[PDB]
């Protein structure tokens, strides 16, 4: 019997945050049923590194941090340790030797309609390359020079957010591949997510 925390519910919803307001859904004390997502799943690019996708239920980790994302298909491969590109460098980054799964599935349907969606922005042109797992929520006119402008854009002072300009008739690599980065956490705290 056991139970089932709403992993499969947060996985599917009309609206997954953005690339920078990416959700931080902690999970504990639940038998997260991964069989649905690996044993029998239609979820492309189910590339999980840190532990083999098979027999993943056998593994217990201390805090499952399901992530929510909408990123262009080309940038899907940018969700990896370091890699390159606007993802994982100016955005949610995954630390080296990170343990977890990356489930990226095409989402041309399910809330991806004509015209660049108001939500599902970029997050680029920040001061540094960011650190792994740190949320970047605050939005401020990004400084690209010495003079600090006083809150209105122009040249430099770039707005650090950019709308994903996709239509439901884009190519193959441009359709938003809704991806979740299931961030395992094997630390010195008691393991909570176990079970078949």
């Amino acid at each position, epitope marked *: 019997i056991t139970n089932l925390c709403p992993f499969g519910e947060v996985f599917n919803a009309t609206r997954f945050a953005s690339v920078y307001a990416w959700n931080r859904k902690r999970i504990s004390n639940c038998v997260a049923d991964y069989s649905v997502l690996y044993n029998s799943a239609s979820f492309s690019t189910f590339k999980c590194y840190g532990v083999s996708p098979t027999k993943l239920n056998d593994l217990c980790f201390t805090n499952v941090y399901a992530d929510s994302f909408v990123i262009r298909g080309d940038e899907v491969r940018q969700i990896a340790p370091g890699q390159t590109g606007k993802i994982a460098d100016y955005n949610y980054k995954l630390p080296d030797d990170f343990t977890g799964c990356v489930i990226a599935w095409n989402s041309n349907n399910l809330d991806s309609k004509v015209g660049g969606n108001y939500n599902y922005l970029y997050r680029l042109f920040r001061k540094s390359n960011l650190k792994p797992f740190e949320r970047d929520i605050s939005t401020e006119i990004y400084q690209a020079g010495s*003079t600090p402008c006083n809150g209105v854009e122009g040249f430099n002072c770039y*707005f650090p957010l950019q709308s994903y300009g996709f239509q439901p008739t884009n190519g193959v690599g441009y359709q938003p591949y809704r991806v979740v980065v299931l961030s395992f956490e094997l630390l010195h705290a008691p393991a909570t997510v176990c079970g078949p």
Partner: antibody
Amino acid sequence: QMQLVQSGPEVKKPGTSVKVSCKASGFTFTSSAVQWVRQARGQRLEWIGWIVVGSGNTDYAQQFQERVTITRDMSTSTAYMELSSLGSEDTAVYYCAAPNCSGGSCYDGFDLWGQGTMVTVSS
Amino acid sequence: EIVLTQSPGTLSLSPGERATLSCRGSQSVRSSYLGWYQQKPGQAPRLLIYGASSRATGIPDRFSGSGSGTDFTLTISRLEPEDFAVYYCQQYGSSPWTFGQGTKVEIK
């Protein structure tokens, strides 16, 4: 010295489309915006349009409404510019500019300038 | 549509005496988002100054911006002969940016 090269001269039927290519190399052409100004023969230059490669923003002068589109290309690190229904008087060299700069937070001024792209609208 | 009237173009300046070029803002604009880049006679231009902050990159520091608000000046305490070129004061503050009035400077 950072190379900002562009396509050679183009001869185009007045009232048609043009595609001015400006490739930026030697520096990160992702954190740098791009700026286009037109210089004819003898009169000082003015906007064509300017874009931010990363920020997805594009502008242009009030005299170039719905007739200038400036498109980026990160894959080849180039800035493309299209003048639709360009007037017969648009015969001029079409420049491209950007800050010669590297890093997330990088230089402010417009150090590097393109070699220019002579554009002629001839019968 | 910002208009930057300047010191009259074709103003005579030669090495051995102080040279000065100036363009005045239509309305006093932020100084650090200006900049005067010169176009050589038959080449692309290159940045020299912006808000009087930096030096003249690739040029001896005789070049130097100055002024506040509308009236910005580039002083050349001892002019040099290679600078026969047309300067103009870039304006990259508010969205509209003005780039042409003909602030030519000749040498000898």
